[PDB]
Amino acid sequence: QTCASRCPRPCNAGLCCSIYGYCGSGAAYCGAGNCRCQCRG
């Protein structure tokens, strides 16, 4: 709901922020274009 607001470190290590407005993993959340933050590492 406010991940982008807590960027570039909205969540902890291991998870990535999805443009949809939610953290997660894999490509769905940490994919090229489908990630708002935590895409580089």
Side-chain angles (χ1 to χ4, degrees), residues 2-41:
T2 57
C3 181
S5 218
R6 302 230 308 195
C7 270
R9 277 217 235 79
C11 291
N12 260 359
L15 309 94
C16 304
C17 192
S18 177
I19 47 139
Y20 257 43
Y22 287 95
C23 272
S25 218
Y29 299 97
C30 209
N34 268 5
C35 66
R36 203 97 93 161
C37 278
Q38 277 225 32
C39 310
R40 212 65 148 283

